Design a protein around this ligand. Structure first.
Ligand SMILES: NC(=O)c1ccc[n+]([C@@H]2O[C@H](COP(=O)([O-])OP(=O)(O)OC[C@H]3O[C@@H](n4cnc5c(N)ncnc54)[C@H](O)[C@@H]3O)[C@@H](O)[C@H]2O)c1
Ligand SMILES: NC(=O)c1ccc[n+]([C@@H]2O[C@H](COP(=O)([O-])OP(=O)(O)OC[C@H]3O[C@@H](n4cnc5c(N)ncnc54)[C@H](O)[C@@H]3O)[C@@H](O)[C@H]2O)c1
Ligand SMILES: O=c1ccn([C@@H]2O[C@H](COP(=O)(O)OP(=O)(O)O[C@H]3O[C@H](CO)[C@@H](O)[C@H](O)[C@H]3O)[C@@H](O)[C@H]2O)c(=O)[nH]1
Ligand SMILES: O=c1ccn([C@@H]2O[C@H](COP(=O)(O)OP(=O)(O)O[C@H]3O[C@H](CO)[C@@H](O)[C@H](O)[C@H]3O)[C@@H](O)[C@H]2O)c(=O)[nH]1
Ligand SMILES: O=c1ccn([C@@H]2O[C@H](COP(=O)(O)OP(=O)(O)O[C@H]3O[C@H](CO)[C@@H](O)[C@H](O)[C@H]3O)[C@@H](O)[C@H]2O)c(=O)[nH]1
Lengths: 460, 162, 460
């Protein structure tokens, strides 16, 4: 039996970082090196404050860094030395050309493949580990099939990651299932077994699914789409609730007790964010079009268009409540991260909402406990940002003289705020726009304070 | 044709002279006719009126361009079904009523003629209230656009779309 | 070295009859039996007057019928006793279901296949022989693959006939090329060689093209469409001639002198007919739609649309020239066959011109030299045929008392008609609509006679 003794992971991001830190923690007798071109990101991994916020991540890293888990920019030597090589890079969507704005760019995957071949001899297992794998494993394989050395035997595997940011550690420590794709050769099932034995250190065997490379990638795509679909479906219902005086939260509860539907992912919101769902459905639509499946394409397209509609519907409500003129009005934006417990803003609903108010010439004051100030200004760019955007150091500086408070992220702190204090120094009418349903049950207090609280999935 | 101009001029298939159907006229056509008679045999010189000459040219270039586009369309169909357009072009070409010339499938036709010529024929037909005829010849340009674009996509595709 | 001694042909049509008759004539020592379900048709092939009209066929057929060539209707024994079996039946366009009015119905090709399997043992070569082969060869093989007997070895070849009705004998005696398709196996190439040897009795080696089954059918589909395209291209130009004042016969000559284009199939007409051209193009469009090639389907569609327009334009001119009514007006239709020297009416533009005029209330008088009376009545209906349609025994009958004469078929004899006699008895002004250009050079004669002679590709 082949035993993985040394692991190398190209990509030290939200996926590779936490994944390898867990692998190393659960597997003391196997050396894990995480590598990356980003010198800044690598140094942070080796420091007291990590480059990404993720609850419980620190304690995991600090228990095996320097012992068992390593972070290096020396990508060559880590590739040369390893039995398993994870490729966990990002695939940004093409900004030009055919597929512009929709299809994923595989250049970094391709580049990594080329670099593996350069720095590899003998047997190595190369596993593609991403959140939205788009023809990835086949791209790697195509590089490996075309650039061969003597005694170079590289096996390509697919191993899509299911963790969700904010809950990475729990998800990795206790996953619903691990999925591994690998060719139906004996060569083949041997490489699959090797990685399968790595997971077996902490994942029960019954939760490890092994299939072929494509079926693996297509499963990931669909699972992602199904998840995005639940949020878009409930958000569609939220529109319908506001229009008819019912409550989306009660509706959602009645929906979710049907054990066939389930009660997860039915929290209506301003719209789904994150570097996964949109990228995922857009690539699924693209694939379908490429395969002459206009019907399938058309069906999944609805998940994005519903998300897009949810965002504009919510922005429009804010503008509306402000007599359709927000020029030179102070408005607090509470929460920027796409999700609570993360510093990640990729495709965050907060970016879109902010831009819609920007176009209306609002003076925005953005607060987020974890998103770095610099990131916020990059996200809201390409002179207009200098005019309209201020980054508040605490929420109260944000609502000091604001016309409206816009809650976009379900940080638990936003429930704890002193709404007595905030209302006293706001210009009236004072609006709170709750895009997360965080302030549910506080409605009566807020109304008797003097707010006019508007939330999604419920209108008076 | 450019690239074989000297051959084509020394030994043309036909020469085409359009003049007014007056006697003034036919005297003008004969003089020019007599310039070409220096190397061109008399039964290779066609004499007609002005417009009948200009329409025949337009048609003539349109008919050739259509040849390329038709075989190009077949090329697409071959790629979808595992045949060879060169083998098909042979079988088609051997029919003496079709002719074997100008059936070489390609990335698409170029030249200062064909595209300008077809689009003009279209425009004329639209002006004369013949939308049926316009739509017909417009398919020669559209197929050519398609062939080029299909070729461009295959390159991009094969390089992982990046 | 397998040699063919006994040939059975299923289909005693315009393809099957003439083809096998020539094969019999050119190859004395090989017995050729032609079979059909249609008793009437077979009795006729055995009698003094044949079921179809084809210049020269009478001599070919009577020189070897009963020596070497037979007609049977006993399909079962002919199949059983044969080395090579042609399938030359018709494939009507579907009248219902998906592909209605466009796609070819393979119900006869399949039923044939099925009967061969029932009556066959040992080795036999089965060749599909048609004008428009649409997935023919595959269908057969699909039937044979699934219905195997012990020691049955059936080979499927493709062999599209290029004969043109009217000149069938000449074409079969001296074809431009012969096209045989068979599997690129050795089983295989041997059946192709054995059919190749049939033709090598009168067709030289380098005129016989041998490719694979599908290539062969695609080659025929394409060739038919290219020829159809020439007719439509010149017909389009004819429309342009009429609005601008030039001559399509003259413009066609200028075109034809270009050896790259060639001077054949540049005769403008009322609209191409026959069981081939339209069926071929519609099936090419349908195939393309099924392979997701909209652009290619859109391209060849124009060949049909243009032909339709040619027919419709010519018709409008007739009603236009007769003061926009033909109600209770006598009109002569000269020529009903799709082309000259044949009895065949399938898809004839005469059928269309006649119907269009009847819908406007014209009392028509039809004459054709070789089309049977009964055929004309079928074609023209689906009772209104009782009121409006008379069938004339000679041209001069059709013309006596008539307001107009429409020529739809380029019969040679039409040039030779006595026009002084025809004018004398017509109602004035008398019109001649030449939809075939057969009366060029006769213009002056006919105008001076007093006619108003309107022809396609030239306007007054
Ligand atoms: C998206 O998200 C998932 C993973 O994304 P993530 O959150 O980890 O993204 P991330 O960008 O936060 O992390 C990816 C890491 O890969 C690194 N990287 C990019 N190109 C590289 C290269 N060619 N060589 C070495 N390192 C490189 C980047 O520095 C980055 O830190 C994927 O599934 C994809 O679909
Ligand atoms: C259509 O028409 C073309 C064929 O040309 P064609 O002019 O010979 O057609 P056609 O109609 O003149 O000849 C077809 C003949 O085959 C016979 N036939 C049809 N199905 C049969 C079966 N089930 N069993 C026995 N005989 C059968 C018919 O009786 C008919 O006489 C094809 O190439 C396609 O384009
Ligand atoms: O009922 C819900 C559920 C989620 N969200 C939002 O959905 C987005 C995505 O959230 P979440 O799925 O928790 O975070 P991700 O990091 O995107 O994780 C998902 O995306 C990963 C990438 O595909 C998958 O691997 C995980 O399995 C899947 O949970 C966020 O903007 C959430 O605010 C809400 O709108 N309502
Ligand atoms: O089988 C072929 C033949 C040509 N081409 C292409 O078609 C374009 C035009 O070809 P060609 O006709 O040889 O060049 P031209 O100089 O445009 O000449 C044509 O056009 C002239 C008007 O420009 C006419 O006068 C000529 O008679 C006619 O041959 C070129 O890009 C060729 O490569 C093909 O793709 N396939
Ligand atoms: O210059 C022309 C030539 C033909 N036609 C018309 O088009 C029709 C078809 O004529 P033709 O092609 O000779 O008769 P087919 O029996 O259909 O034969 C053609 O189609 C056959 C299959 O049907 C092929 O096998 C032959 O190769 C091909 O010549 C007739 O109605 C003609 O009047 C024109 O209008 N103008």
């Amino acid at each position: 039996m082949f035993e993985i003794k040394k692991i190398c992971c190209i990509g030290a991001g939200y996926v590779g970082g936490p994944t390898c830190s867990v692998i190393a923690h659960m597997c003391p007798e196997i050396r894990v090196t995480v590598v990356d071109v980003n010198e800044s990101r690598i140094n942070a991994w080796n420091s007291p404050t990590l480059p990404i916020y993720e609850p419980g991540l620190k304690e995991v890293v600090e228990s095996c860094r320097g012992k068992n888990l390593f972070f290096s920019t020396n990508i060559d030597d880590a590739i040369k030395e390893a039995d398993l090589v994870f490729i966990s890079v990002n695939t940004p969507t093409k900004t030009y050309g055919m597929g512009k704005g929709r299809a994923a760019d595989l250049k970094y995957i391709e580049a990594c493949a080329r670099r593996i071949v350069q720095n590899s001899n003998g047997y190595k297992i190369v596993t593609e580990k991403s959140t939205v794998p788009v023809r990835a494993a086949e791209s790697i394989r195509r590089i490996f099939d075309a650039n061969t050395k003597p005694n170079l035997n590289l096996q390509v595997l697919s191993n899509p990651e299911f963790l969700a940011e904010g809950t990475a550690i729990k998800d990795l420590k206790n996953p619903d299932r691990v999925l591994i794709g690998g060719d139906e050769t004996p060569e083949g099932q041997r490489a699959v077994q090797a990685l399968c034995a790595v997971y077996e250190h902490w994942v029960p065997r019954e939760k490890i699914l092994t299939t072929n490379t494509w079926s693996s990638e297509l499963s990931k795509l669909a699972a992602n789409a199904f998840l995005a679909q639940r949020i878009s479906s409930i958000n569609s219902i939220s529109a319908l609730c506001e229009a008819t005086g019912a409550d989306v939260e009660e509706v959602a509860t009645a929906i979710g007790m049907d054990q066939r539907i389930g009660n997860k992912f039915l929290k209506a919101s301003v719209g789904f964010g994150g570097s996964c769902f949109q990228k995922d459905v857009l690539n699924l639509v693209y694939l379908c079009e490429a395969l002459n499946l206009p019907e399938v394409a058309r069906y999944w397209q609805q998940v994005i268009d519903m998300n897009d509609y949810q965002r504009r519907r919510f922005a429009s409500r804010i503008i509306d409540s402000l007599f359709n003129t927000v020029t030179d009005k102070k408005i607090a934006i509470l929460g920027f991260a796409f999700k609570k417990d993360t510093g990640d803003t990729r495709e965050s609903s907060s970016i879109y909402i902010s831009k819609y108010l920007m176009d209306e010439g609002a003076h925005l004051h953005i607060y987020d406990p974890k998103v770095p100030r610099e990131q916020i200004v990059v996200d809201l760019s390409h002179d207009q940002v200098s005019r309209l955007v201020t980054i508040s150091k605490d929420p109260y500086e944000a609502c000091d003289g604001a016309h409206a408070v816009v809650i976009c992220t379900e940080w638990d702190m936003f429930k704890e705020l002193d709404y007595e204090r905030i209302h006293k120094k706001m210009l009236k009418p004072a609006f709170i726009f709750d895009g997360r349903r965080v302030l549910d049950g506080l409605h009566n207090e807020l109304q008797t304070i003097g707010f006019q609280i508007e939330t999604i999935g419920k209108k008076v």
